[PDB]
Amino acid sequence: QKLIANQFNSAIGKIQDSLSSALGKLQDVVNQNAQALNTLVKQLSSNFGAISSVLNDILSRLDPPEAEVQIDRLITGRLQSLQTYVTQQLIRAAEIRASANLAATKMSECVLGQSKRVDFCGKGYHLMSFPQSAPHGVVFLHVTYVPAQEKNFTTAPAICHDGKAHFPREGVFVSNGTHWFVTQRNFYEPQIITTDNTFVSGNCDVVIGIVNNTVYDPLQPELD
Amino acid sequence: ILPVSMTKTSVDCTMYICGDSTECSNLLLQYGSFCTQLNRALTGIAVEQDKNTQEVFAQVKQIYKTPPIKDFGGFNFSQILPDPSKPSKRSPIEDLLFNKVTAQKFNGLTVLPPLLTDEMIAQYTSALLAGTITSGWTFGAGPALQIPFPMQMAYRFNGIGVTQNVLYENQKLIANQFNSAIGKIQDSLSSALGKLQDVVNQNAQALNTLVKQLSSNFGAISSVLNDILSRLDPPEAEVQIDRLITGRLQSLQTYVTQQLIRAAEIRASANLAATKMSECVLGQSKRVDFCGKGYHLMSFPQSAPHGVVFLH
Amino acid sequence: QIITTDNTFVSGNCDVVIGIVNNTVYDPLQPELD
Amino acid sequence: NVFQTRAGCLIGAEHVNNSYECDIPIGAGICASYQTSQSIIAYTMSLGAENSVAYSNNSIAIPTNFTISVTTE
Ligand SMILES: *[C@@H]1O[C@H](CO)[C@@H](O[C@@H]2O[C@H](CO)[C@@H](O)[C@H](O)[C@H]2NC(C)=O)[C@H](O)[C@H]1NC(C)=O
Ligand SMILES: *[C@@H]1O[C@H](CO)[C@@H](O[C@@H]2O[C@H](CO)[C@@H](O)[C@H](O)[C@H]2NC(C)=O)[C@H](O)[C@H]1NC(C)=O
Ligand SMILES: *[C@@H]1O[C@H](CO)[C@@H](O)[C@H](O)[C@H]1NC(C)=O
Ligand SMILES: *[C@@H]1O[C@H](CO)[C@@H](O)[C@H](O)[C@H]1NC(C)=O
Ligand SMILES: *[C@@H]1O[C@H](CO)[C@@H](O)[C@H](O)[C@H]1NC(C)=O
Ligand SMILES: *[C@@H]1O[C@H](CO)[C@@H](O)[C@H](O)[C@H]1NC(C)=O
Ligand SMILES: *[C@@H]1O[C@H](CO)[C@@H](O)[C@H](O)[C@H]1NC(C)=O
Ligand SMILES: *[C@@H]1O[C@H](CO)[C@@H](O)[C@H](O)[C@H]1NC(C)=O
After folding, report:
1. Across the strands, what pairs with D10?
2. A168, A178, B160, B244 — which has fewest CB within 10 A?
3. Handedness of CA B55, B59, B65, B67 (dihedral sign)
4. B touches C (3+ CB pairs < 8 Å)?
5. How far apart are CA B29 and CA B47, in angstroms?
6. C17 touching chain A per CB within 8 A
7. Which atom of ligand 8 is nearest to the CA of D16?
């Protein structure tokens, strides 16, 4: 318990030291909106194929019966930019809706409970998450489970004791050269081969490769 | 069949709208704000087209070499592994899909090459297939381990409700059914795909439409701007040049908008393929009827031109 | 349910948890061997 | 200096046969970086750590330790 508590506090300090040194997903949505708003003010500085940019300049030098064509070119020229800015914002709104629905599914699975889908809330076995507030977004601090050290052991698919094959339920039979233990595929926990973790089915001569191993039989010495 | 990327096209306004004259460049300064938006939109497509490949194929940062031991307990893995008889990294299957699915740059419609070619995508699928047959799921969620295939199939059966005692009783039966399933897919694919062809036919018809837009007049006396300048003076034919510019600007605004919807459909399929890569390939997906019709055990992803295939 | 053997298991020693209490086991195997 | 790459022409950067992790994407499987004085070099990017995984029918690997990490999305 003191090892997991120390590894959790070191993981929070490594994220806080990395975030203090900018983000990309929370900056591209702002830079695209800032350049789109700066483009609309630049559209008012163009003429769209006319003699002036603003409609107030042509009305002071020419009569509206004469400059009616230049006004319609500025209206249709600004209507094309208004139809472009709305269409460009609708694709960005669909990208926001696609990311908000993806974040809502991750909130109901990674945060609200344990997500059974592996490699979904991040690289590694997800346990839980800690969502925090973000400007125009949201962040997630998941708790992953990745292995660091490992060793190689000789395994066996079944155990032949008296003519019947023994198959495990959650773990796998391991051996480091002279002994025989059983452990899961996620953590090394050596245990004695007992009856409560194994079962019998059929005969022994069903596997192409099998070895001979004895059972501790934790029920025999108790009835004496 | 799920696509992850498509072709990259970079359209200019000055090469596509204006030809070989200086009178078109004077009127293009009034529409320079429209090309700042169209150039940034086509630049945003090319980065998104190169970022979707790094989210599906680049799941791990280690290249897993294929083991020389081909004895996997009666299973035939020569169809998914690259054979050393050919210099290419594609397997027989991957090579059958390259020839199954099938100038445009003369009018300024140049095609930019992607970041990763077909050889590096084939190397990414062979690296994921080497880690699946040797570690299964620990290589995508941590460091690499070693585990035999049969033992690996016993853990995939436990996720759907099947105990692992029946696997070791008919191991020669399931190994013969697995080799018969690969031969049935290879015989069906050798006889075209739909999801990998509509993304190419829509881009081919859109590129053939832009060259046809140059053959129209847009309500004028000529199509090209070089014809009216030889018969009329630019002070007189200034209205005909502006009608050809706003006529081509409407087609350029339509081609960029049509490509952005196709880029959103590619992004929606690449994110769907990335979730299937991390669940059906990288481990066992607990969601039933997600990786196909039936109880999913594992998958075998291969390389595809402008896409990716999955053999669950 | 009564604390039995079929639902529990042992691993290591007792002095591993920072907070623990003393409790007895029903042992549903002892009265059957008599 | 001048290197005829598969994606066009990259000039002003020498080519090296060694492969490292690239940062600036260029295209066609070749990147451009600044390594060792030090000059801008162009080389083929590495697809990952080239390592061999020992596969056997009677060998398993069980992890004995773990590290609790936080993935920021
Ligand atoms: C695995 O499948 C391949 C099919 O590609 C088998 O290769 C064929 O083997 C037969 C038998 O000699 C030959 O007649 C064919 O010419 C082979 N085809 C190719 C493309 O090589 C291979 O034998 C199978 N392996 C096992 C162990 O069944
Ligand atoms: C698993 O790894 C952790 C992290 O390195 C080990 O914890 C360290 O243990 C050493 C000696 O026991 C201490 O000096 C360090 O201070 C510990 N670090 C932390 C962050 O707690 C742990 O011992 C390893 N466990 C095994 C079984 O190898
Ligand atoms: C590893 O093998 C040695 C051989 O004598 C044995 O003493 C030791 O107990 C084994 N390791 C474990 C964890 O049982
Ligand atoms: C593993 O395969 C080799 C090669 O066929 C064989 O000699 C060996 O007996 C096999 N091991 C087991 C445990 O079946
Ligand atoms: C011990 O293993 C050998 C080889 O698998 C087998 O022939 C023999 O019957 C086994 N011994 C017993 C008592 O089952
Ligand atoms: C709970 O925490 C309090 C505060 O430290 C402590 O006094 C108490 O003993 C704890 N209870 C248990 C069961 O550990
Ligand atoms: C009862 O609990 C106390 C406090 O945890 C402990 O010191 C004592 O050893 C326990 N009794 C037995 C018989 O274990
Ligand atoms: C890199 O090494 C290979 C090894 O044969 C050689 O052929 C090639 O010319 C070298 N390239 C450079 C740029 O030195």
Report:
1. D3
2. A178
3. negative
4. no
5. 27
6. yes
7. 13
